[PDB]
């Protein structure tokens, strides 16, 4: 799947878009957030003020189902 960063996350991660082979959302986030811990707490739980869209829809609707290779994951910070 394709990961797109929005807002301050772009400068904080130092990239805007990246592809990852992971089909499990948590693993996608861990690969992105590996040595930085910017969007995940130590418990790998998402930090507050971060939303995730999968193909334009809130991630929680998907119930941790298999991601397809062509899915677009948007990570969006909010106030």
Author numbering: 2 to 80
Q: What does the original paper state about this entry?
A:
The eukaryotic Urm1 (ubiquitin-related modifier-1) protein, which displays both structural and amino-acid sequence homology to the prokaryotic ThiS and MoaD, has been proposed as a candidate for the evolutionary ‘missing link' between the eukaryotic Ub/Ubl family and the ancestral prokaryotic sulphur-transfer proteins1617181920212223. Here we solve the crystal structure of an Urm1/SAMP homologue from the related species S. solfataricus, which reveals similarities to both eukaryotic Urm1 proteins, and other archaeal SAMPs. Taken together, our data suggest that Urm1/SAMP modification acts as a signal for substrate recognition by the archaeal proteasome.
As predicted, the S. solfataricus Urm1 adopts a ubiquitin-like β-grasp fold, formed from a four-stranded β-sheet packed against a central α-helix. Similar to Ub and other Ubls, the β-strands are organized in the order β2-β1-β4-β3. Four α-helices are also evident, with the first connecting strands β1 and β2, the second and third located between strands β2 and β3, and the final helix positioned on a long loop between strands β3 and β4. Inspection of the surface hydrophobicity of the S. solfataricus Urm1 structure revealed the presence of a solvent-exposed hydrophobic patch in close proximity to the C-terminal tail. This surface is composed of the conserved hydrophobic residues L52 and L54 on strand β3, I77 on strand β4, and I79 on the C terminus of the protein. We observed in the structure that a leucine (L67) on the final loop on one Urm1 subunit protrudes into the hydrophobic depression of a neighbouring Urm1 chain to form a dimerization interface. The structure also reveals a narrow hydrophobic channel, juxtaposed to the first hydrophobic patch abutting the C-terminal tail. This trough is lined with the surface exposed conserved residues L27, L47 and G50, and extends from the base of the C-terminal tail to the opposite end of the structure.
